[PDB]
Design a protein around this ligand. Sequence first.
Ligand SMILES: [Zn+2]
Ligand SMILES: [Zn+2]
Lengths: 180, 261, 353, 541
Amino acid sequence: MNAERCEFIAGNSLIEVIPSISDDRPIHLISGDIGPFEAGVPCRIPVWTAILMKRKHNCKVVAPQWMDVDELKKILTSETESQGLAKLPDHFFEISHMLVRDAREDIFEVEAVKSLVQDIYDRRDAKLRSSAIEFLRQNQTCHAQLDNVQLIEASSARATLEACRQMGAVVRNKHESTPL
Amino acid sequence: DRAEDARKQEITEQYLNFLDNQADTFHYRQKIVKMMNDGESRLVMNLDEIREILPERAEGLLTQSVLEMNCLQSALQMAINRSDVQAVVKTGFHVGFEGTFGERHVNPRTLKSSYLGNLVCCEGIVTKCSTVRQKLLTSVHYCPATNKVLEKKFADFTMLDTAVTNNNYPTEDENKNPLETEFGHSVYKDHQTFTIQELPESAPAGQLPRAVDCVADLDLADRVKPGDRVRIIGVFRVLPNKQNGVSSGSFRSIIIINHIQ
Amino acid sequence: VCNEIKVRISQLPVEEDIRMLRQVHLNMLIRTAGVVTIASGILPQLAVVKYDCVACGYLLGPFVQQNDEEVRPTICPSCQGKGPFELNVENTVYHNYQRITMQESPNKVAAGRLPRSKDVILLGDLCDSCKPGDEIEVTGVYTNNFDGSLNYKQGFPVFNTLIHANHITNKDKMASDQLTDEDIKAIRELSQDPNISQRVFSSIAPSIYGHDDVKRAIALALFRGEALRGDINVLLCGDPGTAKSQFLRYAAHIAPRSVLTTGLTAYVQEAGAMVLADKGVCLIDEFDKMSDQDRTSIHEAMEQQSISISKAGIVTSLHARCTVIAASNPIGGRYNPTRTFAENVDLTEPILS
Amino acid sequence: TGRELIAEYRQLITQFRNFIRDFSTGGFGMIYRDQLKRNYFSHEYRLEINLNHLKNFDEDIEMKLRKFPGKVLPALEEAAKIVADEITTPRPKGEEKLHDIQVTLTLDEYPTSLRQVKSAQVSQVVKISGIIVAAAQVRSKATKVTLQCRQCKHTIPDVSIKPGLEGFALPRTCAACPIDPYIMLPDKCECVDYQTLKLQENPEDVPHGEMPRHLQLFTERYLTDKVVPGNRVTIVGVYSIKKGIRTPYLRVLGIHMETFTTFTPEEERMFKTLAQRKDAYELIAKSIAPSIYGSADIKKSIACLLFGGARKKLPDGITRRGDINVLLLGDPGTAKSQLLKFVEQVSPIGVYTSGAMVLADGGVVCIDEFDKIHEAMEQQTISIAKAGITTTLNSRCSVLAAANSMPTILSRFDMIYIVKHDVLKDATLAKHVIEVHVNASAAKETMFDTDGFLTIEFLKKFVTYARLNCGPRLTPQASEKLVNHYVKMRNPPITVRQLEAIVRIAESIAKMELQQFATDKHVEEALRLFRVSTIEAAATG
Ligand SMILES: [Zn+2]
Ligand SMILES: [Zn+2]
């Protein structure tokens, strides 16, 4: 599992667009019907389909509601105050990076949105680092709780799994060395 | 302040219990008995042995070396006072160290300002020597006008003790009677300085070798000559300077020696 | 570009010797001439000063810096008190400064006398305008000031004296190596003629008769190979009185840049003859009368066309890319035709190569 | 009026914080933010800023930073500290202390000539180029100090000192007590590293027939120990006057430099391919000095000199030498110095010269003009006892010597050649050599080279590989031949020195093939080389 496959799974989310082309029938995808398209009237389609239309100039993308600057400030406030990881929308970082990559014309207040997302990422990264360092001093348990971790955050932190597997062998050796 | 006094009492008590444990596992009491039978005045300790029984003292003895070392020497004096043997020596008793240093094993090239105030161990070749000279420590005076005896103590930046005083030589009583020096009762110490340079097997090619200055007192004086290959343990420290109330910010640094190998 | 246009004044009618200045000429304008012996480096000096008032932040000044004073205020008027002072880094102004020493010319000294000397001060765009050894001529104001240590030295209330320079002419400035269209037309018209090679060869040193081999060697050595040394090196050996020095004198006349010397490299206490002759011609007489220090240094210089210097850890090298023409005498006072050139000349084969 | 200066200072800190946070190359690329985070987790408390990027972001603060650096630059360092705290919080336990960060600068402009720094440029940022000529030892400078009164023991803490070669003046009288009563505590002050350097102007820029000029440089913290004498540098710094005449110096804000023992599996496979080849020894001997004709046995001898024998120490402590020494005699021509220069280039460590004997531990020394030390050759040591000194200098090396011609020192050399009627063969050689020089004039107008010879960059690495890894021995059958050869030559000048020299040459030939053992083949080639070299001296003179 890696970051490309995380972005691949994040592509299945739904997002709203405004077409400029028009069409009569629906489109019968294996993942379900999406059409019909009328020019100037919004509708919801998958994110991969939205990016595919945006590259061909066939639509305009409408950003999610959580990309409002006030909503991002609320998220940053909750993340600053809470000791653990705060809850986020699904595929938050992946959808942010995909939309800044392919559709930054349609985002509103782009630099402020970008800076707030970078702030949230920075302090969540610091929280995960501190939690892993404090775990690796442990000897009494082999368990931790990591509520509201994102999939890409979990994917970036797989060294801890290998370290815990190495620690368990030495602990088992001490238990077998205890006399009777 | 009173919390600092309580902590110093605790640290001295811990070192005293280590030195004068009831059944001494490290035999430093028997080494104290050997020291007082031989008339010597400093005791050599293994920092690796302190590290086992009091690691919170041993690792703090590198970072916060001055206060810990003062507390240890005070504990040594109390441990000596518990003996039935008498303290003949008019200078106090002292401590030197040996063992594993790790981070603080250095060269004259790698001694830099991050290490100031720490205990260090350094290696090199002696390149200079001063002759041994005597330095005043305390002065004893008799007042013939009143039959009283006056005493005064002296201190210096090159000494481990941070305390400072006026350092004026006394000549008159508070009632302005004249005074007479008692040379048989005043206290002096032997003093020497030298320098060490990088070993030629370690200095990088083409460049000039770097060097460090050193101060040694009491039984550590008169032990070295030019050309000796030595390993030296002491505290790395900095010395301020003044001229007419204007100070250049560039200060000089030395090693105050505890032990020589 | 600027703040102020200076006026320099030249061709003042009355000249004085350094030897002849009296108390009459104090605060008068005078003109003298002589040879430079010592020159300092260029240093910045205070010109206009302002100070901070520590007590209330007020800026004191401007004070035009006088010649021999530490100008300071004593009272800040904005607080009417003797507040402490600091130098204002942001509003202080500097100018360039240099000091030289000038001696009487040896040609003008009378019988058995010693030449005198004076100190001269240069400010601004007069700095860096002359070297030691230059024949120069100075115009400036002759002034005096008190010095208590000079009083204690001489035992009488004597006064120090100086000249503040206002105009300088350097008599040793070489001509500009720039050509007009008339000069280039003359060069083209000369180069078109078929006899030009014999013209050049025979017209070098026309007073000396014969010795066309020496003339052609000098002529082809004044031009250079293209370059991988490009320089063409020539050595002459001959009996005394055979005019072997006149060739060096004519080469010194005609060469574009030249150093004429006699038996040479840099000196530590300063550039030597080959370093001064870099991308010029180095002419040496008495080449056989060298020392071994000269021989080793010159072998380094001819091998590398550059000379290395090391002193107390400081390590340097200098370029010495020059054409060498040298002259010498044979062993025993006269050449012997029963022996080779390498026997008649005492130089070794690594030098003669 | 201090609140106005406070307002200016806080405004500058706000603007520099905005610059560090908001500058971007497009997308999510905030380069200074990312660089600061990476440096802080790498435990390097520094940052580097480009002034043209700053000029594009905001022209006014850049112009102010150039013209008033001593006023404006601490605000930039403070802004960097604040942004680092924001980026890194919440830090793990034990790492709560916030560190202090040094800011350095780069600037894209033409440098100013060192002779043409105008006096109007004092206390301004300038860019200068030059050569480092000297470098002093690192020393300590105090940043913040604590003062105490001598008599009444009242204290002034955290008195801060301005940077550079500047002193500071103590208070004259007590704040709460004779003239100058304050003293400085040695234990309660803060210190940083500093270094002094000397810069020489480039020799290209010196006007004709003059000496170069010099300038003194001051460096601090991470800019110390970055340069060595001989380096070519460009420097950004503040032009200052040292504390009515003062000398100048430069306080450095940025330096820009204008300029073995480890191998890959590809390199190991290349070395082993050459060792696997049958013609490897002959190929290396051919590869030595291909521009110089002939001299096949001499090139083989130079290969033996480069590789050397094994080095031994028996249980009684008496060591046995591995080095090999070669001497060349005859006429002063025939490119002897060029051969010595080739060996100097190819050898892993080496020197050419006409003391010098000491300077090549593990290396090779080439001596020209040898007709201008016995202890040095045999014992690998020289000794002295003159008035007031006795020492010994010890160093291990091999020696190649060229002469133009003592019979005593011939015992110390393992191989000797006399170089010596060429004219008909020399006609063909003259054709080839002059064609080479005319082709060089036309020019004036990675195991193998184009002509099949080995390259210098591969050969040097291969020698450095082989010396640290091969270490051979002789086979018993190889040992059996030398005893009979020795007895036959001695009972038909034969000595144990010559016997050990032959053993060393056989080990050296077996080293090039990367062998475990030397054999009868290597012994026979060693005997051929020894006879061909040494018997010339027996026949001649
Ligand atoms: Zn005022
Ligand atoms: Zn006081």
